[PDB]
């Protein structure tokens, strides 16, 4: 066509995702926790509000993030398990699964608390535990025997409309075996079945406070530099608070590159 006005003007996807994540602090006051009320397991998990609010404030809607859970039991009640620390480790995520290092957290503070599992974000509130989540939990269980199947949970924080719904799951032995055997990453893969997991009781509380531990050398968001992430990488931890998702330290290239031209 003769002389027609043509020029493409567009922006990258992470721009829109950052402008979206800037308002994540809103979903924190409307946080709902799902209870089928038929679980009656016995093992009850209490999640403090502060670490959950910082977990949500630093996440992304599309790309998933995860944190390890460490906690002990209250003085008198063995049946109760109070999540008391969230360990953020260098990770890189997609909307289905999160890629984490093979090294479990190791530090002095965590020596007194039990590894209670892991927590991760989820863009869609699927009514079942993801096959990727089952596989990741079972592989973490097999490589590290610190996670007993009965005392470790998968907490899923689903990005419901204008809110965030929590639900907690524990793996059953058949789920452990299937997750150790799975090398398929399909959304409905081989040998996946709802009897592979079971629902455990999660509780939100503001009675006690929990703390974060973040890696001491680099931060946790390797999503913007997914190359540097190898599963055999090894990290040291420190007592600090996790940076937001789009903090300048997480994406140094976006600044340096823009500077060179």
């Amino acid at each position: 066509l003769g002389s027609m006005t043509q020029t493409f003007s567009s922006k990258t996807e992470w721009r829109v995702r950052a402008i979206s994540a800037a308002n994540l602090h809103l979903r924190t006051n409307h946080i709902y926790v799902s209870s089928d009320d038929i679980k009656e397991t016995g093992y009850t998990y209490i999640l403090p509000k502060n670490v959950l609010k910082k977990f949500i404030c630093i996440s992304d809607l599309r790309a998933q993030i995860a944190g390890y859970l460490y906690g002990v039991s209250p003085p008198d009640n063995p049946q109760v398990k109070e999540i008391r620390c969230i360990v953020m480790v260098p990770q890189w995520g997609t909307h289905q699964t999160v890629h984490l290092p093979g090294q479990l957290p190791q530090h002095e503070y965590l020596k007194e608390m039990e590894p209670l599992g892991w927590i991760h974000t989820q863009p869609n509130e699927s009514p079942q535990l993801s096959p990727q989540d089952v596989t990741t939990h079972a592989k973490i269980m097999a490589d590290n025997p610190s996670w007993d199947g009965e005392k470790t949970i998968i907490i899923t924080c689903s990005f419901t409309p204008g809110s965030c719904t929590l639900t907690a799951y524990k793996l059953t032995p058949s789920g452990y075996e299937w997750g150790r055997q799975n090398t398929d990453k399909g959304n409905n893969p081989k040998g996946y079945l709802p009897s592979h997991y079971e629902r455990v009781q999660m509780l939100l509380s503001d009675r006690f406070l929990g703390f974060f531990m973040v890696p001491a050398q680099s931060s946790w968001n390797y999503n913007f530099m997914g190359v540097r992430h190898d599963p055999n990488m090894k990290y040291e931890l420190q007592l600090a608070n996790p940076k937001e998702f789009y903090h300048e330290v997480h994406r140094p290239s976006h600044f340096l590159n823009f500077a060179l031209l």
């Binding site: 003007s9 721009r15 406070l209 420190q238 608070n241 500077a259």
Partner: protein, 1724 residues
């Protein structure tokens, strides 16, 4: 006042800027003419017209000028005509002046004359100048001008020693030069921001001369700044009564009379008007006004006319063209050169084959500029900002060499340097102003300066100026350049902001204050002269001829504007303004009100960096910034890849500003020139705006936003991001090496501990790695350890130890580095505390101890956090976790002892006559606390503890035990210890009048003098003493039988064990328990205190039974206590005080309308200022004199004896103030008036809360912080001071209530509540203060081994608290081995510090013994570090002046200084007093001490506060000089000990060693001793030799004077000395010899030493010293008193078979001239 009407200020603004043409026509000078040429109209003005001379004008040679100022005018002889006219008014009068002279003409030389006048004022006799005493302010309109002004003023005034410099950059820390500078040249806005922040003890006080250059800027839009400054200066002169001189400089413009009225310039004396005739060279004027309305054709036509004019000057001297931009200089030079090349006209500029063209070709390679080498050879040149200063100077030099024939320049050259040219052409008068968002016409000042640069000093007979512009604006540029442009005010535009500036200053606080303020403005003057131009109807002016209603309406509109934007809380009825933090921040960072309202609305704690960038982008300074089409493509290309996202479309200028800022931080070059200009604007403004957002979000305690804003400030400054390797911040490091470093992703962190070669291998460029290492270690970094001190289960005290872990290079770090300390909660949302930390070079290596209070709660929060962030260095951040895993929290407070509803106890329960008599004279029933505790104190012998609020009557409880002791034995001894001496005197008066006057018992107040006090303890039944006076005595409890025979020990305000002096209280109180255990005769102990949460600990410490300890609660106070805490959140202290001003009046009229009121203020100045504020608010809101209750004439007698007229007036209105500087009679009279109820309100300094004897219904505490001149920083009121201040609200027999309002910072509210509503925990600090006690106990053999030292520590309160709150003393465990190990470490450290200090000796690392230094320490009650410095410094060196220096620098005197720059004045006279040496470290305590001491020796008259300082210094002085004598005698030489004795007597009689002894005689003037020396007689007892008739004939004195003199002549010691050697001839070289000296007083009078100039009372003392002056060896020393007669023997080991003299024994400790010497000799 009412009713008012709101104005539209927008409509009232001319909206013409400085282009307002108030003149209606324009006449032209005869001879001028107008032509029309090629579509542009040309106007021609002849100028010329220099009147030869007036009536009689003769130029003044500099020889006729005053001598002092001739040297500054070096290199000149004949002043110009204007200068010769103004020499009188500039150097011989102090009048304020306004000079309207044509531009050029050296109008700055008259300013130099005025400066030389003010410089000559402060010239002293030495030839030097009191440079510290005065400061001069020069106000130049352009920084360009300011730099040249600083340079030339320094050059001409270096001969007098003035450091002339301008102040630049951040004013937060660059203040050293500020004190150093004597002349400050600066732009008006910089002076405005300075005076806005202001403060006390500022240098603005010493500013005496202000010079406003180019004051016609009043017409400019910057004019309102000049208006604000002059109004402020006049108002502040009125308030200070200290006149300041104003010197205004303007051009030949109309309205000059109104400008003189503005500057308070008298028309006859001060006003000097000269026209354009007095221009140096005649200015042939050509004005070109074009009519072509096509832009392309306008460009071509303007170039064509410029070319025509330059070719008309082809062979003429020079051509100087001025254009708007930097690139346009190149464009215009290229255009004219190319048009010369199209013709053959170029060859006319060149002098054929020139040597000058050879020079231009010589600097073709030397110019190293892309445009310069292309345009320099043809005679063309350009001058612009983006050019090397060396290149610019070279262009200037070639123009001065006359080589450069055409120069095109931006206005920066026109303002900066002195570069005249014959012909000057202005190529266009329109320029892009990024603020306006448009191209606007040129500011009249720029035009006036450029066209004043036309013509030359001597090179040209005449100059010619051509001005090319639009035809419409022609007239304007005509009337400006031919004196028809009036000067008008543009303040209406900026009025709200200006008003806030004055509200924040407190200068304005009501609407009428603002009407006055506006009356001092040029706007008011111009409205009064031409109401038509400012929109005031003529009948409207008739309505109020002074324009009161119009001014008040303007003020009402501005106040409504500021209240809308939430800067200022405005009350419509009252007209009152209450400053808010937002308003202060706006004034203090040059932010307009709309911008601040934007910040307040948008800024939330949950903002992201995206949103923060947008918030900055929405600033009202950028409102006229617009996105134009010509740039949208480039802006879209940027916004497509910006690091910080931008949500809006590119059409919105918010996006333009956001993108421009991001590009500035990323250091990007933009193609559009409008983009470059708008970026310059946005970014230069961005700094202050982001700092303002920083203070907002920080003082709001938002952690995340605070971090982001600080980092954005650092990024805007350093032009980088966080991700960039911070090494680039050095500016000495190459860019490419940092690029190669950035490629490597090894964290810069990870190259800290690495060595040089490994660094080099990592970079892959190894050789230079060392440099990197240097610049790696120069990068600032700190190391933080934390000591957690649990105060209560809810409050934690934290001691942070900051240790610098970098190397300090002054090339990099400067004089100081700055950090921010931020304590952050668990989730890093809330800043629990923030603090500014300045690492100075003085302590760049040393540790830094910062202590603060943070709340806590149960269950314990996991951690807190402590971040330390460099204020300017990027990524320089060090963070420390604070874990509570191992926090040991104290037990909860036990329930207080119940106050039972018991029957009030009558006085008849004492069952004794005189007891009953006194306490029925005073009341019929006992205080309920007294009633509850009566039986245990009166009818038992047990130790007892009482805890109750201050003002409960604890003194009567102690009197009970005193009475029981007197009943058990009428000769018994009680010792009452109270921590404050000013309270000890209250106790002494009351208890003498009681016990001694009504019982024939003894009440003695100890003095600190050892023998006096021992007598007083021997003769007394009730011995009152401060803690130290009892420590020094009770230490020798083995050698003092009186100390052991004590029966009762009472101690008041025992909670003060937790204060600064706490240790000595704890020590004496444990000493009494140890003594009572040792003697087996029980010493009863009675303790009174305030309510203690841990009272049981102290009770057990004192052996008080559980049944004997009584601890109450502040609700049991006899007078019921109403407490109100009011939070004021302004961080800036001074503004917080201003904000608290009016609520003081409110609290008075609410809580105590009729009853008396005491206000406590942080400083002495605040006393008077708060009194004045009370009176002003009272006059305005209701009616003054509600405070006065006695008739004014009944008080005029009492009143007229007072010194301060301010005090007598405020007293007349009913308000009196108390401060340290008030003489004792004045304070007594004010307190008498207060107790009498004649005056209602007393405003009192904080320091008097112990000294005050009065009381009131209401107590209003202001601020609770005071400035320290030592640290130069604010310190908090300790809780004990607050408790006592509140205890002042105890009026028992008059008020049913007691009300107290504490006005504090919001953050402290909780803490104060927490610790004022409930009993207070106290703990021991003895673990720090311990070395002197240990040394003394090693002296008195109370402690013999280290195990004995731990034994000693068992008796203390420290032991009781260590098992109850271990972390407070850095313990970790309550077990017995932990305690033994902690005490082991402490004892070893204290004893080793003693041993190394040489006070004690450790044998076998086990047993300790006392050395002589420790003995001199414990004997004279002196700190051991003083003794160590003494031992090291004295040696055999003897200097009286050096001795004064050594004594001064003793560690005891580390107290007193505040403000007092008058030490400088003393320093000047200290330049006179024998010792001026050492660098003048004013504000240093020891400096002040020896300064005051040497003033005292010369009987110098000083201030009253200085006299109190002198008193304390003198007491501790004599004790120190005795210590020095004992040191110099123990092993020193003879001359220094003798000189120290001479110094003792010099101090006693305030005599210098050179002064005549007759200066000791009372009522003896200097003329009297001159008469006596005219007789030659100087002997002190020679006066005693003359007959009383003869001495009366010579003296000519009054009988009372002669009586004082006779008492002194009798008291003067004359003694008979006899020297004797036992077995003299039969002595042995190896054996010892004893010399016997017998001394007998002939007179034998009893009494003290007569020294009125000495503070305390002192007795005679004497020294005896064997030692030869030939060898300077002291042999045998002994000191002794000479009551009656006495024999003394001196033992000394004989020398070896050699003749020796019998030396110079006799020496005094008080009277001067009583010194004797007897000599003799015998061999062995």
């Amino acid at each position: 006042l009412a009713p008012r009407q709101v104005l539209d200020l927008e409509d009232l603004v001319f909206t013409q800027g400085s282009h307002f043409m108030a003149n209606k026509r324009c006449q032209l000078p005869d001879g001028s003419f107008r032509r029309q040429r090629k579509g542009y109209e040309e106007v021609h003005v002849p100028a010329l017209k220099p009147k030869p001379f007036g009536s009689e004008e003769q130029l003044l040679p500099v020889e006729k000028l005053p001598k002092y100022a001739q040297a500054g005018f070096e290199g000149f002889k004949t002043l110009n005509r204007i200068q010769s006219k103004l020499y009188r008014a500039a150097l011989e009068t102090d009048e304020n002046l306004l000079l309207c002279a044509p531009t050029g003409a050296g109008k700055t030389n008259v300013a130099l004359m005025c400066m030389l006048r003010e410089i000559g004022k402060h010239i002293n006799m030495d030839g030097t100048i009191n440079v510290d005493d005065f400061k001069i302010i020069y106000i130049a309109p352009m920084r360009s001008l300011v730099q040249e002004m600083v340079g030339s003023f320094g050059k001409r005034l270096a001969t007098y020693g003035i450091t002339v410099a301008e102040l630049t950059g951040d004013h937060q820390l660059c203040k050293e030069e500020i004190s150093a500078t004597q002349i400050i040249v600066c732009t008006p806005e910089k002076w405005d921001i300075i005076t806005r922040k202001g403060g006390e003890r500022t240098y603005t006080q010493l500013v005496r001369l202000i010079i406003l250059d180019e004051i016609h800027l009043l017409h400019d839009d910057r004019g309102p700044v000049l208006e604000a400054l002059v109004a402020r200066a006049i108002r502040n002169i009125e308030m200070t009564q200290e006149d300041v001189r104003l010197i205004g400089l303007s051009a030949t413009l109309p309205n000059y009379e109104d400008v003189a009225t503005f500057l308070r310039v008298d028309p006859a004396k001060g006003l000097f008007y000269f026209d354009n005739s007095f221009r140096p060279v005649p200015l042939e004027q050509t004005y070109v006004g074009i009519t072509e309305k096509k832009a392309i054709k306008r460009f071509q036509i303007m170039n064509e006319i410029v070319y025509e004019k330059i070719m008309e000057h082809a062979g003429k001297n020079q051509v100087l063209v001025f254009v708007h931009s930097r690139k346009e200089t190149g464009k215009t030079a290229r255009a004219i050169r190319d048009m010369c090349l199209e013709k053959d006209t170029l060859g006319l500029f060149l002098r054929e084959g020139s040597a000058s063209t050879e020079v231009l070709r010589t600097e073709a390679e030397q110019c190293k500029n892309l445009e310069l080498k292309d345009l320099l050879p043809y005679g063309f040149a350009i001058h612009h900002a983006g050019m090397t200063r060396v290149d610019r100077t070279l262009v200037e030099d070639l123009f001065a060499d006359k080589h450069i024939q055409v120069l095109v320049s931006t206005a920066t050259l026109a303002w900066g340097v002195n570069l005249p040219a014959h012909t000057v052409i202005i190529k266009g008068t329109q320029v892009y102003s990024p603020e306006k968002g448009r191209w606007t016409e040129l500011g009249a000042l720029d035009i006036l300066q450029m066209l004043g640069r036309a013509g030359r000093p001597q090179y040209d007979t005449k100059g010619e100026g051509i001005l090319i512009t639009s035809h419409g604006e022609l007239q304007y540029y005509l009337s400006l350049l031919n004196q028809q442009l009036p000067i008008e005010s543009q303040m209406v535009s900026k009025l709200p902001d200006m008003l806030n500036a004055e509200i924040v200053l407190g200068n304005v606080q009501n609407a009428k204050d603002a009407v006055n303020w506006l009356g001092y403005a040029y706007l008011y003057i111009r409205m009064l002269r031409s109401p038509t131009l400012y929109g005031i109807s003529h009948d409207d002016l008739k309505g109020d001829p002074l324009l009161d209603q119009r001014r008040l309406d303007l003020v009402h509109t501005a106040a409504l504007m500021l209240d809308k934007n939430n800067l200022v809380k405005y009350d419509k009825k009252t007209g009152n303004f209450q400053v808010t933090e937002l308003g202060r921040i706006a004034s203090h960072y040059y932010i307009t009100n709309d911008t601040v309202q934007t910040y307040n609305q948008l800024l939330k704690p949950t903002l992201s960096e995206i949103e923060l960038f947008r918030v900055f982008s929405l600033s009202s300074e950028f409102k006229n910034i617009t996105v134009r089409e010509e740039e949208k493509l480039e802006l879209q290309k940027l916004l497509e890849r910006v690091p910080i996202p931008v949500k809006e479309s590119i059409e919105e200028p918010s996006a333009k500003i956001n993108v421009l800022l991001q590009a500035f931080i990323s250091q990007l070059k933009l193609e559009g020139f409008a983009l470059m200009a708008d970026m310059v604007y946005v970014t230069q403004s961005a700094g202050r705006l982001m700092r303002a957002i920083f203070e907002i979000v920080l003082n709001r305690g938002w952690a995340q936003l605070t971090d982001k804003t600080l980092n954005l400030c650092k990024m805007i400054d350093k032009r980088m991001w966080q991700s960039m390797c911070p090494l680039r911040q050095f500016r000495k490091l190459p860019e490419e090496v940092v690029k190669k470093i950035e490629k490597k992703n090894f964290p810069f962190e990870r190259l800290y501990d690495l060595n040089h070669n490994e660094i080099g291998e990592l970079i892959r460029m190894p050789k230079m790695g060392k440099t990197i290492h240097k610049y790696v270690h120069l990068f600032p970094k700190l190391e933080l350890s934390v000591h957690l001190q649990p105060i209560t289960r809810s409050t934690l005290k934290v001691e942070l130890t900051i240790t610098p872990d970098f190397q300090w290079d002054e090339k990099v770090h400067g004089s100081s580095e700055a950090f921010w300390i931020l304590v952050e909660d668990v989730d890093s949302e809330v800043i629990l505390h923030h603090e500014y930390f300045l690492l100075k070079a003085k302590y760049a290596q040393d540790e830094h101890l910062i202590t603060f209070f943070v709340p806590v709660f149960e269950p314990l929060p996991p951690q807190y956090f402590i971040r330390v962030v460099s204020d300017r260095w990027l990524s320089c951040e060090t963070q420390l976790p604070v874990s509570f895993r191992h926090l040991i929290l104290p037990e909860k407070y036990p329930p207080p002892t119940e106050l039972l509803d018991l029957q009030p106890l009558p006085v008849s329960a004492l069952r004794n006559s005189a007891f009953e008599s006194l306490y029925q004279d005073k009341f019929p029933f006992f205080n309920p606390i007294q009633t509850q505790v009566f039986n245990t104190v009166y009818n038992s012998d047990d130790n007892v503890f009482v805890g109750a609020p201050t003002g409960s009557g604890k003194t009567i409880c102690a009197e009970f035990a005193i009475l029981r002791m007197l009943l058990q034995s009428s000769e018994g001894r009680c010792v009452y210890i109270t921590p404050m001496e000013a309270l000890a005197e209250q106790v002494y008066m009351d208890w003498y009048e009681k016990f001694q006057d009504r019982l024939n018992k003894k009440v003695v107040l100890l003095t600190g003098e050892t023998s006096t006090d021992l007598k007083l303890l021997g003769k007394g039944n009730i011995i009152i003493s401060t803690p130290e006076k009892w420590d020094i005595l009770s230490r020798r409890w083995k050698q003092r039988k009186n100390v052991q025979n004590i029966n009762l020990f009472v101690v008041d305000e025992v909670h003060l064990i937790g204060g600064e002096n706490g240790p000595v209280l704890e020590v004496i109180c444990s000493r009494m328990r140890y003594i009572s255990s040792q003697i087996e005769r029980p010493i009863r102990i009675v303790a009174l205190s305030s309510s203690l949460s841990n009272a049981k600990d102290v009770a057990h410490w004192l052996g008080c039974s559980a049944t004997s300890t009584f601890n109450f609660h502040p609700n049991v106070r006899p007078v019921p206590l109403e407490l109100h805490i009011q939070g004021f959140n302004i961080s800036h202290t001074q503004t917080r005080l201003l904000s608290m001003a009016k609520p003081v009046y409110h609290a008075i009229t609410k809580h105590s309308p009729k009853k008396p009121v005491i206000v406590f203020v942080p400083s002495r100045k605040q006393t008077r200022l708060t009194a004045i504020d009370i009176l002003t608010t009272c006059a305005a809101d209701i009616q003054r004199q509600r405070f006065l209750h006695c008739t004014e004439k009944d008080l005029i007698p009492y009143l007229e004896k007072l010194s301060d007229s301010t005090l007598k007036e405020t007293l007349l209105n009913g308000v009196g103030y108390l401060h340290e500087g008030l003489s004792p009679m004045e304070r007594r009279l004010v307190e008498q008036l207060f107790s009498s109820g004649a005056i209602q309100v007393v405003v009192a300094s904080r320091s008097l809360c112990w000294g005050m004897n009065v009381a009131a219904h209401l107590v209003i505490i202001m601020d609770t912080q005071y400035y320290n001149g030592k640290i130069h920083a604010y310190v908090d009121y300790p809780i004990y001071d607050v408790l006592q201040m509140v205890g002042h609200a105890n009026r028992p027999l008059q008020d049913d209530e007691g009300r107290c309002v504490i006005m504090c910072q919001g953050s402290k509210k909780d803490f104060f509540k927490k610790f004022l509503y409930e009993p207070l925990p106290v703990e021991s600090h003895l673990d720090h203060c311990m070395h002197d006690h240990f040394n003394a106990e090693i002296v008195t053999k109370t402690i013999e081994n280290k195990q004995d030292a731990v034994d000693y520590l068992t008796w203390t309160f420290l032991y009781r608290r260590m098992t109850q709150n271990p972390n407070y003393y850095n313990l970790q465990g309550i077990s017995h081995r932990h305690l033994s190990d902690h005490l082991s470490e402490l004892v070893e450290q204290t004893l080793s510090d003693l041993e190394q200090s040489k006070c004690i000796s450790i044998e076998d690392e086990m047993d300790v013994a006392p050395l002589n230094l420790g003995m001199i320490a414990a004997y004279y009650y002196i700190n051991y570090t003083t003794i160590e410095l003494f031992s090291m410094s004295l040696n055999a060196k003897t200097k009286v002046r050096g001795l004064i220096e050594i004594i001064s620098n003793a560690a005891e005197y580390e107290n007193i200084p505040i403000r007092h720059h008058e030490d400088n004045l003393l320093r000047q006279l200290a330049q006179k007093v024998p010792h001026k040496l050492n660098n003048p470290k004013f504000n240093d305590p020891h400096v002040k001490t020896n300064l005051l001491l040497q003033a005292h020796l010369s009987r110098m008259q000083l201030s009253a506060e200085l006299q109190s300082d002198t008193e304390e210094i003198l007491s501790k002085a004599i004790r120190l000089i005795q210590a020095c004598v004992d040191v110099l005698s123990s092993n020193g030489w003879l001359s220094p000990a003798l000189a120290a004795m001479e110094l003792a007597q010099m101090v006693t009689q305030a005599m210098w060693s050179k002064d005549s002894y007759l200066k000791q005689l009372p009522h003896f003037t200097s003329e009297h001793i001159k008469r006596c020396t005219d007789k030659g007689v100087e002997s002190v007892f020679d006066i005693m030799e003359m007959e009383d008739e003869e001495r009366n004939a010579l003296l000519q004195l009054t009988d009372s004077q002669i009586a004082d003199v006779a008492r002194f002549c009798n008291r003067y010691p004359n003694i008979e000395l006899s020297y004797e050697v036992v077995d003299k001839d039969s002595i042995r070289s190896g054996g010892p010899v004893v010399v016997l000296v017998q001394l007998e007083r002939e007179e034998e009078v009893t009494g003290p030493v007569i020294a009125p100039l000495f503070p305390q009372k002192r007795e005679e003392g004497w020294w005896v010293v064997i030692g030869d002056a030939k060898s300077n060896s002291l042999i045998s020393i002994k000191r002794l008193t000479l009551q009656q007669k006495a024999k003394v023997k001196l033992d000394f080991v004989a020398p070896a078979t050699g003749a020796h003299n019998y030396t110079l024994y006799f020496m005094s400790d008080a009277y001067m001239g009583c010194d004797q010497e007897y000599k003799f000799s015998v061999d062995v």
